[PDB]
Amino acid sequence: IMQHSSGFLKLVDDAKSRIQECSVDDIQKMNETQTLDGLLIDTREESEVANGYIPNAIHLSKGIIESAIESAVPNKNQKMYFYCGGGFRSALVADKLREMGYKNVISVDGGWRAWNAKGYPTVSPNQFRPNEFLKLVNNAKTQIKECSTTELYNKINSQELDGIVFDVREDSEFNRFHIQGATHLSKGQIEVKIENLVPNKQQKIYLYCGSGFRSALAAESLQHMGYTNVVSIAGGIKDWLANNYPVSQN
Amino acid sequence: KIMQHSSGFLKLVDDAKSRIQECSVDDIQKMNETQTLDGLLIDTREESEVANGYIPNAIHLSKGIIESAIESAVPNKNQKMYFYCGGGFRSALVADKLREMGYKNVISVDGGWRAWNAKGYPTVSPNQFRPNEFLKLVNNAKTQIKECSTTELYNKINSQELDGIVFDVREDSEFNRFHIQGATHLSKGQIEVKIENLVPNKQQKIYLYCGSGFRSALAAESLQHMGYTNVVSIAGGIKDWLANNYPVSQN
Numbered sequence: 079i080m081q082h083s084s085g086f087l088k089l090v091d092d093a094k095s096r097i098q099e100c101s102v103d104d105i106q107k108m109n110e111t112q113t114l115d116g117l118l119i120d121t122r123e124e125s126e127v128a129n130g131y132i133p134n135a136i137h138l139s140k141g142i143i144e145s146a147i148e149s150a151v152p153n154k155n156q157k158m159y160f161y162c163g164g165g166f167r168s169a170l171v172a173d174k175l176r177e178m179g180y181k182n183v184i185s186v187d188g189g190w191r192a193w194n195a196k197g198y199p200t201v202s203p204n205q206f207r208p209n210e211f212l213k214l215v216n217n218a219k220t221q222i223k224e225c226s227t228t229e230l231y232n233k234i235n236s237q238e239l240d241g242i243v244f245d246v247r248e249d250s251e252f253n254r255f256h257i258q259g260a261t262h263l264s265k266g267q268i269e270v271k272i273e274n275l276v277p278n279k280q281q282k283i284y285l286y287c288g289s290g291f292r293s294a295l296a297a298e299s300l301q302h303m304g305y306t307n308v309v310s311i312a313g314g315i316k317d318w319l320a321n322n323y324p325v326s327q328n
Numbered sequence: 329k330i331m332q333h334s335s336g337f338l339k340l341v342d343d344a345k346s347r348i349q350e351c352s353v354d355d356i357q358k359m360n361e362t363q364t365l366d367g368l369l370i371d372t373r374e375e376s377e378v379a380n381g382y383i384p385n386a387i388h389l390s391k392g393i394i395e396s397a398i399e400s401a402v403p404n405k406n407q408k409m410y411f412y413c414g415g416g417f418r419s420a421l422v423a424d425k426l427r428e429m430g431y432k433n434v435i436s437v438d439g440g441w442r443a444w445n446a447k448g449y450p451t452v453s454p455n456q457f458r459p460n461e462f463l464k465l466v467n468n469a470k471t472q473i474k475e476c477s478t479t480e481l482y483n484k485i486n487s488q489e490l491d492g493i494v495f496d497v498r499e500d501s502e503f504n505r506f507h508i509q510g511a512t513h514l515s516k517g518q519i520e521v522k523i524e525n526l527v528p529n530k531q532q533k534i535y536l537y538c539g540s541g542f543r544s545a546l547a548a549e550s551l552q553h554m555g556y557t558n559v560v561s562i563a564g565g566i567k568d569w570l571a572n573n574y575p576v577s578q579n
Protein backbone atom coordinates (compact mmCIF):
# COMPACT_ATOMS: atom_id res chain seq x y z
CA ILE A 79 0.00 0.00 0.00
CA MET A 80 1.54 3.26 -1.18
CA GLN A 81 0.62 6.64 0.37
CA HIS A 82 1.53 9.09 -2.37
CA SER A 83 1.75 12.74 -1.43
CA SER A 84 -0.12 15.57 -3.10
CA GLY A 85 2.90 17.37 -4.55
CA PHE A 86 4.24 14.23 -6.22
CA LEU A 87 0.86 13.50 -7.76
CA LYS A 88 0.61 17.07 -9.13
CA LEU A 89 3.79 16.38 -11.13
CA VAL A 90 2.36 13.06 -12.23
CA ASP A 91 -0.96 14.58 -13.34
CA ASP A 92 0.93 17.17 -15.39
CA ALA A 93 3.08 14.49 -17.05
CA LYS A 94 0.07 12.26 -17.81
CA SER A 95 -1.58 15.13 -19.69
CA ARG A 96 1.17 14.85 -22.32
CA ILE A 97 2.01 11.17 -22.67
CA GLN A 98 0.27 8.09 -23.96
CA GLU A 99 -0.66 5.29 -21.57
CA CYS A 100 -1.60 1.66 -22.09
CA SER A 101 -3.01 -0.99 -19.77
CA VAL A 102 -1.24 -3.87 -18.09
CA ASP A 103 -3.64 -5.99 -20.19
CA ASP A 104 -2.07 -4.67 -23.40
CA ILE A 105 1.40 -5.71 -22.21
CA GLN A 106 0.19 -9.11 -21.02
CA LYS A 107 -1.63 -9.80 -24.30
CA MET A 108 1.42 -8.82 -26.38
CA ASN A 109 3.65 -10.98 -24.15
CA GLU A 110 1.38 -14.03 -24.37
CA THR A 111 1.06 -13.81 -28.17
CA GLN A 112 4.74 -12.83 -28.79
CA THR A 113 3.66 -9.55 -30.39
CA LEU A 114 5.37 -7.02 -28.08
CA ASP A 115 6.33 -4.20 -30.44
CA GLY A 116 8.66 -2.02 -28.36
CA LEU A 117 11.23 -2.15 -25.61
CA LEU A 118 9.61 -2.89 -22.25
CA ILE A 119 11.55 -0.89 -19.65
CA ASP A 120 11.31 -1.29 -15.88
CA THR A 121 12.13 2.11 -14.34
CA ARG A 122 12.14 0.96 -10.69
CA GLU A 123 15.10 0.91 -8.33
CA GLU A 124 17.66 -1.89 -8.36
CA SER A 125 16.29 -3.11 -5.01
CA GLU A 126 12.74 -3.32 -6.46
CA VAL A 127 13.62 -5.25 -9.61
CA ALA A 128 15.58 -7.72 -7.47
CA ASN A 129 12.19 -8.92 -6.11
CA GLY A 130 10.72 -9.78 -9.53
CA TYR A 131 9.81 -8.10 -12.80
CA ILE A 132 7.51 -8.25 -15.83
CA PRO A 133 8.43 -10.81 -18.54
CA ASN A 134 10.36 -9.35 -21.53
CA ALA A 135 11.45 -6.32 -19.47
CA ILE A 136 14.87 -4.66 -19.33
CA HIS A 137 16.02 -2.34 -16.54
CA LEU A 138 16.74 1.39 -16.92
CA SER A 139 15.95 3.12 -13.62
CA LYS A 140 14.25 6.51 -13.56
CA GLY A 141 17.30 7.86 -11.75
CA ILE A 142 19.72 7.11 -14.57
CA ILE A 143 17.54 6.97 -17.66
CA GLU A 144 18.11 10.50 -19.00
CA SER A 145 21.88 10.12 -18.59
CA ALA A 146 21.92 6.77 -20.39
CA ILE A 147 19.19 6.75 -23.02
CA GLU A 148 21.06 8.36 -25.90
CA SER A 149 23.83 5.76 -25.71
CA ALA A 150 21.55 2.82 -24.97
CA VAL A 151 18.72 3.64 -27.45
CA PRO A 152 20.12 6.18 -29.96
CA ASN A 153 17.05 5.85 -32.23
CA LYS A 154 14.62 8.62 -31.27
CA ASN A 155 11.84 6.74 -33.10
CA GLN A 156 12.23 3.57 -30.97
CA LYS A 157 8.93 2.52 -29.41
CA MET A 158 9.30 2.10 -25.64
CA TYR A 159 6.90 1.06 -22.89
CA PHE A 160 7.77 2.15 -19.34
CA TYR A 161 6.49 0.74 -16.07
CA CYS A 162 7.17 1.42 -12.41
CA GLY A 163 5.50 0.43 -9.15
CA GLY A 164 2.17 2.12 -9.76
CA GLY A 165 2.12 3.92 -13.09
CA PHE A 166 3.22 7.28 -11.64
CA ARG A 167 7.04 7.37 -11.81
CA SER A 168 6.86 5.83 -15.29
CA ALA A 169 4.69 8.75 -16.47
CA LEU A 170 7.41 11.21 -15.38
CA VAL A 171 9.98 9.07 -17.22
CA ALA A 172 7.95 8.99 -20.45
CA ASP A 173 7.36 12.75 -20.30
CA LYS A 174 11.06 13.52 -19.78
CA LEU A 175 12.03 11.26 -22.68
CA ARG A 176 9.33 12.96 -24.81
CA GLU A 177 10.96 16.27 -23.89
CA MET A 178 14.30 14.87 -25.15
CA GLY A 179 12.78 13.98 -28.54
CA TYR A 180 11.69 10.33 -27.98
CA LYS A 181 8.03 10.69 -28.89
CA ASN A 182 7.16 6.99 -29.30
CA VAL A 183 6.92 6.44 -25.57
CA ILE A 184 4.11 4.83 -23.57
CA SER A 185 3.59 4.54 -19.81
CA VAL A 186 1.90 1.43 -18.40
CA ASP A 187 -1.02 2.64 -16.27
CA GLY A 188 -1.20 0.96 -12.85
CA GLY A 189 2.30 -0.50 -13.20
CA TRP A 190 3.59 -3.42 -11.15
CA ARG A 191 0.76 -3.02 -8.62
CA ALA A 192 -1.87 -3.49 -11.32
CA TRP A 193 0.14 -6.31 -12.94
CA ASN A 194 0.13 -8.31 -9.70
CA ALA A 195 -3.42 -7.30 -8.77
CA LYS A 196 -4.51 -9.24 -11.88
CA GLY A 197 -2.26 -12.23 -11.12
CA TYR A 198 -0.18 -11.89 -14.29
CA PRO A 199 3.06 -13.90 -14.66
CA THR A 200 6.28 -12.58 -13.14
CA VAL A 201 9.97 -13.52 -13.33
CA SER A 202 12.69 -13.48 -10.66
CA PRO A 203 16.24 -12.30 -11.49
CA ASN A 204 17.56 -15.53 -9.97
CA GLN A 205 15.32 -17.42 -12.43
CA PHE A 206 16.93 -15.93 -15.55
CA ARG A 207 18.74 -18.38 -17.86
CA PRO A 208 19.85 -17.67 -21.46
CA ASN A 209 17.94 -20.77 -22.46
CA GLU A 210 18.25 -20.40 -26.24
CA PHE A 211 21.99 -19.70 -26.06
CA LEU A 212 22.55 -22.75 -23.89
CA LYS A 213 20.47 -24.83 -26.31
CA LEU A 214 22.68 -23.69 -29.21
CA VAL A 215 25.78 -24.45 -27.15
CA ASN A 216 24.56 -27.95 -26.29
CA ASN A 217 23.69 -28.39 -29.98
CA ALA A 218 27.31 -27.53 -30.89
CA LYS A 219 28.85 -29.68 -28.13
CA THR A 220 27.00 -32.77 -29.46
CA GLN A 221 28.81 -32.35 -32.79
CA ILE A 222 32.34 -31.38 -31.75
CA LYS A 223 35.31 -32.69 -29.81
CA GLU A 224 36.18 -31.08 -26.50
CA CYS A 225 39.21 -31.20 -24.27
CA SER A 226 39.70 -30.15 -20.65
CA THR A 227 41.87 -27.25 -19.52
CA THR A 228 43.99 -29.79 -17.63
CA GLU A 229 44.59 -31.85 -20.77
CA LEU A 230 45.60 -28.79 -22.82
CA TYR A 231 47.79 -27.33 -20.06
CA ASN A 232 49.51 -30.67 -19.51
CA LYS A 233 50.29 -30.90 -23.24
CA ILE A 234 51.70 -27.37 -23.32
CA ASN A 235 53.68 -27.80 -20.09
CA SER A 236 55.06 -31.14 -21.33
CA GLN A 237 56.14 -29.68 -24.71
CA GLU A 238 53.69 -31.96 -26.51
CA LEU A 239 51.31 -29.34 -27.88
CA ASP A 240 49.76 -30.93 -30.97
CA GLY A 241 47.65 -28.11 -32.43
CA ILE A 242 47.28 -24.39 -33.00
CA VAL A 243 45.54 -22.56 -30.15
CA PHE A 244 43.16 -19.70 -30.96
CA ASP A 245 41.59 -17.34 -28.43
CA VAL A 246 38.16 -16.56 -29.91
CA ARG A 247 37.22 -13.86 -27.36
CA GLU A 248 36.89 -10.15 -28.19
CA ASP A 249 39.83 -7.77 -28.64
CA SER A 250 39.39 -6.31 -25.13
CA GLU A 251 39.31 -9.75 -23.47
CA PHE A 252 42.40 -11.03 -25.33
CA ASN A 253 44.33 -7.82 -24.64
CA ARG A 254 43.77 -8.04 -20.87
CA PHE A 255 45.25 -11.57 -20.68
CA HIS A 256 45.31 -14.84 -22.60
CA ILE A 257 46.86 -18.29 -22.62
CA GLN A 258 50.54 -17.72 -23.41
CA GLY A 259 51.29 -18.08 -27.12
CA ALA A 260 47.64 -18.29 -28.14
CA THR A 261 46.73 -16.53 -31.40
CA HIS A 262 43.85 -14.08 -31.23
CA LEU A 263 41.13 -14.92 -33.76
CA SER A 264 37.81 -13.54 -32.55
CA LYS A 265 34.70 -15.68 -33.03
CA GLY A 266 33.30 -12.75 -35.01
CA GLN A 267 36.15 -13.03 -37.57
CA ILE A 268 37.00 -16.73 -37.41
CA GLU A 269 35.05 -17.95 -40.47
CA VAL A 270 36.25 -14.98 -42.54
CA LYS A 271 39.94 -15.52 -41.78
CA ILE A 272 40.43 -19.22 -41.08
CA GLU A 273 40.98 -20.48 -44.64
CA ASN A 274 43.78 -17.97 -45.28
CA LEU A 275 45.38 -18.64 -41.89
CA VAL A 276 44.96 -22.44 -41.81
CA PRO A 277 44.46 -23.79 -45.37
CA ASN A 278 45.05 -27.40 -44.24
CA LYS A 279 41.56 -28.28 -43.01
CA GLN A 280 42.94 -31.36 -41.20
CA GLN A 281 45.27 -29.23 -39.06
CA LYS A 282 44.54 -29.71 -35.36
CA ILE A 283 43.04 -26.52 -33.93
CA TYR A 284 42.15 -25.73 -30.30
CA LEU A 285 39.61 -22.96 -29.65
CA TYR A 286 38.98 -21.40 -26.26
CA CYS A 287 36.81 -18.58 -24.97
CA GLY A 288 35.68 -17.44 -21.53
CA SER A 289 33.51 -20.41 -20.65
CA GLY A 290 33.63 -23.14 -23.29
CA PHE A 291 30.42 -21.82 -24.88
CA ARG A 292 31.52 -19.41 -27.64
CA SER A 293 34.37 -21.74 -28.60
CA ALA A 294 31.91 -24.63 -29.01
CA LEU A 295 29.79 -22.52 -31.39
CA ALA A 296 32.91 -21.50 -33.32
CA ALA A 297 34.09 -25.12 -33.55
CA GLU A 298 30.71 -26.24 -34.93
CA SER A 299 30.94 -23.52 -37.58
CA LEU A 300 34.48 -24.52 -38.61
CA GLN A 301 33.26 -28.12 -38.97
CA HIS A 302 30.61 -26.93 -41.46
CA MET A 303 33.51 -25.47 -43.44
CA GLY A 304 35.26 -28.85 -43.56
CA TYR A 305 37.74 -28.53 -40.67
CA THR A 306 37.92 -32.05 -39.24
CA ASN A 307 40.27 -31.73 -36.23
CA VAL A 308 38.88 -28.75 -34.25
CA VAL A 309 38.71 -29.04 -30.47
CA SER A 310 36.92 -26.75 -28.00
CA ILE A 311 38.37 -26.27 -24.51
CA ALA A 312 35.62 -27.18 -22.05
CA GLY A 313 35.12 -24.58 -19.32
CA GLY A 314 37.21 -21.94 -21.15
CA ILE A 315 39.67 -19.59 -19.51
CA LYS A 316 37.39 -19.34 -16.46
CA ASP A 317 38.01 -23.03 -15.71
CA TRP A 318 41.69 -22.52 -16.64
CA LEU A 319 42.03 -19.79 -14.02
CA ALA A 320 40.05 -21.84 -11.50
CA ASN A 321 42.74 -24.51 -11.80
CA ASN A 322 45.31 -21.74 -11.21
CA TYR A 323 46.84 -22.27 -14.64
CA PRO A 324 48.83 -19.22 -15.78
CA VAL A 325 47.90 -16.44 -18.20
CA SER A 326 49.90 -13.75 -19.98
CA GLN A 327 49.57 -10.14 -21.11
CA ASN A 328 51.39 -8.69 -24.12
CA LYS B 329 38.83 -1.92 -47.77
CA ILE B 330 39.09 -4.51 -50.56
CA MET B 331 38.10 -7.91 -49.17
CA GLN B 332 39.21 -11.35 -50.39
CA HIS B 333 36.56 -13.70 -49.02
CA SER B 334 37.19 -17.42 -49.24
CA SER B 335 34.84 -19.93 -50.84
CA GLY B 336 34.18 -21.83 -47.61
CA PHE B 337 33.06 -18.69 -45.78
CA LEU B 338 30.79 -17.67 -48.65
CA LYS B 339 29.13 -21.10 -48.74
CA LEU B 340 28.15 -20.56 -45.09
CA VAL B 341 26.93 -17.07 -45.97
CA ASP B 342 24.92 -18.30 -48.97
CA ASP B 343 23.22 -20.88 -46.74
CA ALA B 344 22.40 -18.23 -44.11
CA LYS B 345 21.09 -15.72 -46.67
CA SER B 346 18.62 -18.32 -47.94
CA ARG B 347 16.77 -18.22 -44.58
CA ILE B 348 16.81 -14.53 -43.62
CA GLN B 349 15.34 -11.28 -44.88
CA GLU B 350 17.65 -8.59 -46.27
CA CYS B 351 17.22 -4.86 -46.82
CA SER B 352 19.36 -2.27 -48.60
CA VAL B 353 21.59 0.43 -47.14
CA ASP B 354 19.16 2.81 -48.87
CA ASP B 355 16.34 1.54 -46.64
CA ILE B 356 18.41 2.25 -43.53
CA GLN B 357 19.46 5.68 -44.77
CA LYS B 358 15.89 6.66 -45.68
CA MET B 359 14.59 5.60 -42.25
CA ASN B 360 17.44 7.47 -40.51
CA GLU B 361 16.88 10.66 -42.51
CA THR B 362 13.11 10.71 -41.85
CA GLN B 363 13.37 9.52 -38.20
CA THR B 364 11.31 6.43 -39.03
CA LEU B 365 13.76 3.66 -38.08
CA ASP B 366 11.51 0.92 -36.74
CA GLY B 367 13.94 -1.48 -35.08
CA LEU B 368 17.25 -1.74 -33.32
CA LEU B 369 20.15 -1.10 -35.69
CA ILE B 370 22.99 -3.36 -34.59
CA ASP B 371 26.63 -3.17 -35.72
CA THR B 372 28.03 -6.73 -35.48
CA ARG B 373 31.63 -5.80 -36.32
CA GLU B 374 34.69 -6.10 -34.08
CA GLU B 375 35.56 -3.50 -31.44
CA SER B 376 38.53 -2.37 -33.56
CA GLU B 377 36.26 -1.82 -36.58
CA VAL B 378 33.56 0.18 -34.77
CA ALA B 379 36.25 2.40 -33.24
CA ASN B 380 36.83 3.76 -36.78
CA GLY B 381 33.24 4.92 -37.32
CA TYR B 382 29.74 3.49 -37.53
CA ILE B 383 26.26 4.06 -38.97
CA PRO B 384 23.98 6.66 -37.29
CA ASN B 385 21.47 5.23 -34.76
CA ALA B 386 23.54 2.03 -34.37
CA ILE B 387 24.41 0.14 -31.21
CA HIS B 388 27.21 -2.41 -30.90
CA LEU B 389 26.77 -6.18 -30.35
CA SER B 390 29.63 -8.00 -32.06
CA LYS B 391 29.00 -11.27 -33.87
CA GLY B 392 31.39 -12.93 -31.42
CA ILE B 393 29.28 -12.18 -28.34
CA ILE B 394 25.77 -11.68 -29.71
CA GLU B 395 24.34 -15.17 -29.03
CA SER B 396 25.71 -15.12 -25.48
CA ALA B 397 24.25 -11.65 -24.83
CA ILE B 398 20.99 -11.33 -26.75
CA GLU B 399 18.57 -12.91 -24.29
CA SER B 400 19.69 -10.51 -21.54
CA ALA B 401 20.07 -7.45 -23.79
CA VAL B 402 16.91 -7.94 -25.93
CA PRO B 403 14.59 -10.39 -24.10
CA ASN B 404 11.68 -9.73 -26.51
CA LYS B 405 11.78 -12.36 -29.25
CA ASN B 406 9.49 -10.17 -31.36
CA GLN B 407 11.91 -7.19 -31.29
CA LYS B 408 12.70 -5.97 -34.80
CA MET B 409 16.45 -5.81 -35.41
CA TYR B 410 18.58 -4.77 -38.39
CA PHE B 411 22.12 -6.17 -38.47
CA TYR B 412 25.07 -4.86 -40.44
CA CYS B 413 28.73 -5.80 -40.75
CA GLY B 414 31.58 -4.91 -43.09
CA GLY B 415 29.96 -6.21 -46.22
CA GLY B 416 26.65 -7.96 -45.59
CA PHE B 417 28.16 -11.41 -45.01
CA ARG B 418 28.88 -11.73 -41.26
CA SER B 419 25.56 -9.98 -40.55
CA ALA B 420 23.64 -12.66 -42.49
CA LEU B 421 25.25 -15.33 -40.30
CA VAL B 422 24.21 -13.30 -37.23
CA ALA B 423 20.62 -12.85 -38.39
CA ASP B 424 20.33 -16.55 -39.22
CA LYS B 425 21.68 -17.60 -35.81
CA LEU B 426 19.27 -15.29 -33.97
CA ARG B 427 16.46 -16.65 -36.14
CA GLU B 428 17.51 -20.14 -35.02
CA MET B 429 17.18 -18.94 -31.38
CA GLY B 430 13.64 -17.74 -32.00
CA TYR B 431 14.26 -14.07 -32.97
CA LYS B 432 12.42 -14.11 -36.28
CA ASN B 433 11.98 -10.34 -36.72
CA VAL B 434 15.51 -9.96 -38.04
CA ILE B 435 16.93 -8.31 -41.16
CA SER B 436 20.47 -8.24 -42.55
CA VAL B 437 21.65 -5.07 -44.35
CA ASP B 438 22.91 -6.22 -47.75
CA GLY B 439 26.28 -4.70 -48.66
CA GLY B 440 26.93 -3.48 -45.09
CA TRP B 441 29.40 -0.76 -44.15
CA ARG B 442 31.17 -1.03 -47.51
CA ALA B 443 27.99 -0.25 -49.48
CA TRP B 444 27.07 2.47 -46.95
CA ASN B 445 30.35 4.26 -47.58
CA ALA B 446 30.36 3.54 -51.33
CA LYS B 447 27.18 5.65 -51.51
CA GLY B 448 28.69 8.41 -49.37
CA TYR B 449 26.11 8.12 -46.61
CA PRO B 450 26.82 9.89 -43.29
CA THR B 451 28.86 8.21 -40.57
CA VAL B 452 29.59 8.82 -36.88
CA SER B 453 32.91 8.50 -35.11
CA PRO B 454 32.87 7.12 -31.53
CA ASN B 455 34.58 10.33 -30.40
CA GLN B 456 31.77 12.42 -31.95
CA PHE B 457 29.24 11.00 -29.51
CA ARG B 458 27.79 13.41 -26.99
CA PRO B 459 24.54 12.88 -25.02
CA ASN B 460 23.34 16.17 -26.42
CA GLU B 461 19.73 15.95 -25.22
CA PHE B 462 20.77 14.91 -21.71
CA LEU B 463 23.26 17.79 -21.54
CA LYS B 464 20.55 20.20 -22.76
CA LEU B 465 18.26 19.07 -19.92
CA VAL B 466 21.12 19.52 -17.43
CA ASN B 467 21.84 23.06 -18.65
CA ASN B 468 18.08 23.66 -18.54
CA ALA B 469 18.08 22.68 -14.85
CA LYS B 470 21.27 24.58 -13.93
CA THR B 471 19.71 27.80 -15.26
CA GLN B 472 16.95 27.53 -12.66
CA ILE B 473 18.65 26.10 -9.56
CA LYS B 474 21.27 27.06 -6.99
CA GLU B 475 24.61 25.25 -6.85
CA CYS B 476 27.50 25.21 -4.40
CA SER B 477 30.95 23.66 -4.59
CA THR B 478 32.20 20.44 -3.01
CA THR B 479 34.59 22.59 -0.93
CA GLU B 480 31.70 24.70 0.40
CA LEU B 481 29.87 21.55 1.48
CA TYR B 482 33.06 19.98 2.88
CA ASN B 483 33.92 23.11 4.88
CA LYS B 484 30.39 23.34 6.24
CA ILE B 485 30.44 19.72 7.43
CA ASN B 486 33.86 20.07 9.07
CA SER B 487 32.94 23.37 10.75
CA GLN B 488 29.84 21.75 12.28
CA GLU B 489 28.06 24.50 10.33
CA LEU B 490 26.00 22.07 8.24
CA ASP B 491 22.81 23.96 7.50
CA GLY B 492 20.86 21.47 5.41
CA ILE B 493 19.88 17.86 4.88
CA VAL B 494 22.19 16.01 2.46
CA PHE B 495 20.80 13.46 -0.01
CA ASP B 496 22.80 11.17 -2.29
CA VAL B 497 20.54 10.81 -5.35
CA ARG B 498 22.63 8.09 -7.05
CA GLU B 499 21.57 4.45 -7.46
CA ASP B 500 21.55 1.80 -4.71
CA SER B 501 24.78 0.24 -5.99
CA GLU B 502 26.57 3.61 -6.12
CA PHE B 503 25.54 4.61 -2.58
CA ASN B 504 26.45 1.22 -1.15
CA ARG B 505 29.96 1.39 -2.63
CA PHE B 506 30.70 4.67 -0.81
CA HIS B 507 29.06 8.02 -0.14
CA ILE B 508 29.67 11.34 1.60
CA GLN B 509 29.64 10.51 5.32
CA GLY B 510 26.20 11.03 6.87
CA ALA B 511 24.34 11.55 3.60
CA THR B 512 20.95 9.86 3.32
CA HIS B 513 20.39 7.74 0.23
CA LEU B 514 17.39 9.10 -1.72
CA SER B 515 17.73 8.03 -5.35
CA LYS B 516 16.72 10.45 -8.09
CA GLY B 517 14.22 7.75 -9.14
CA GLN B 518 12.42 7.96 -5.77
CA ILE B 519 13.09 11.55 -4.70
CA GLU B 520 9.72 13.05 -5.72
CA VAL B 521 7.84 10.10 -4.18
CA LYS B 522 9.51 10.37 -0.76
CA ILE B 523 10.53 14.03 -0.34
CA GLU B 524 7.32 15.39 1.20
CA ASN B 525 7.42 12.84 4.02
CA LEU B 526 11.17 13.20 4.65
CA VAL B 527 11.21 17.00 4.37
CA PRO B 528 7.72 18.41 5.05
CA ASN B 529 9.02 21.98 5.43
CA LYS B 530 9.52 23.13 1.85
CA GLN B 531 11.82 25.97 2.99
CA GLN B 532 14.20 23.50 4.65
CA LYS B 533 17.67 23.69 3.09
CA ILE B 534 18.44 20.53 1.11
CA TYR B 535 21.72 19.54 -0.54
CA LEU B 536 21.57 17.05 -3.43
CA TYR B 537 24.62 15.39 -4.91
CA CYS B 538 25.25 12.73 -7.53
CA GLY B 539 28.29 11.45 -9.42
CA SER B 540 28.88 14.50 -11.61
CA GLY B 541 26.47 17.27 -10.65
CA PHE B 542 24.16 16.34 -13.53
CA ARG B 543 21.48 14.08 -11.97
CA SER B 544 21.34 16.25 -8.86
CA ALA B 545 20.68 19.32 -11.03
CA LEU B 546 17.74 17.55 -12.66
CA ALA B 547 16.50 16.40 -9.24
CA ALA B 548 16.83 19.92 -7.83
CA GLU B 549 14.78 21.38 -10.67
CA SER B 550 12.05 18.80 -10.02
CA LEU B 551 11.99 19.63 -6.30
CA GLN B 552 11.55 23.31 -7.18
CA HIS B 553 8.45 22.44 -9.26
CA MET B 554 7.07 20.93 -6.04
CA GLY B 555 7.65 24.22 -4.22
CA TYR B 556 10.94 23.51 -2.44
CA THR B 557 12.67 26.89 -2.28
CA ASN B 558 16.04 26.10 -0.67
CA VAL B 559 17.49 23.18 -2.69
CA VAL B 560 21.18 23.30 -3.62
CA SER B 561 22.92 20.93 -6.05
CA ILE B 562 26.60 20.11 -5.42
CA ALA B 563 28.45 21.19 -8.56
CA GLY B 564 30.80 18.51 -9.84
CA GLY B 565 29.27 15.74 -7.71
CA ILE B 566 31.16 13.13 -5.74
CA LYS B 567 33.71 12.92 -8.58
CA ASP B 568 34.83 16.48 -7.81
CA TRP B 569 34.67 15.62 -4.09
CA LEU B 570 37.18 12.82 -4.72
CA ALA B 571 39.17 15.07 -7.07
CA ASN B 572 39.82 17.32 -4.05
CA ASN B 573 40.90 14.24 -1.99
CA TYR B 574 37.91 14.59 0.34
CA PRO B 575 37.30 11.23 2.06
CA VAL B 576 34.17 9.10 1.72
CA SER B 577 32.39 6.56 3.91
CA GLN B 578 30.96 3.07 3.71
CA ASN B 579 27.89 2.03 5.72
Ligand SMILES: [Mg+2]
Binds near residue numbers: 217298
Ligand atom coordinates in the same frame (compact mmCIF):
# COMPACT_ATOMS: atom_id res chain seq x y z
MG1 LIG C 1 23.91 -25.96 -36.48
Ligand SMILES: [Mg+2]
Binds near residue numbers: 468549
Ligand atom coordinates in the same frame (compact mmCIF):
# COMPACT_ATOMS: atom_id res chain seq x y z
MG1 LIG D 1 11.76 21.55 -17.02
Ligand SMILES: [Mg+2]
Binds near residue numbers: 509510511577
Ligand atom coordinates in the same frame (compact mmCIF):
# COMPACT_ATOMS: atom_id res chain seq x y z
MG1 LIG E 1 26.31 6.20 5.70
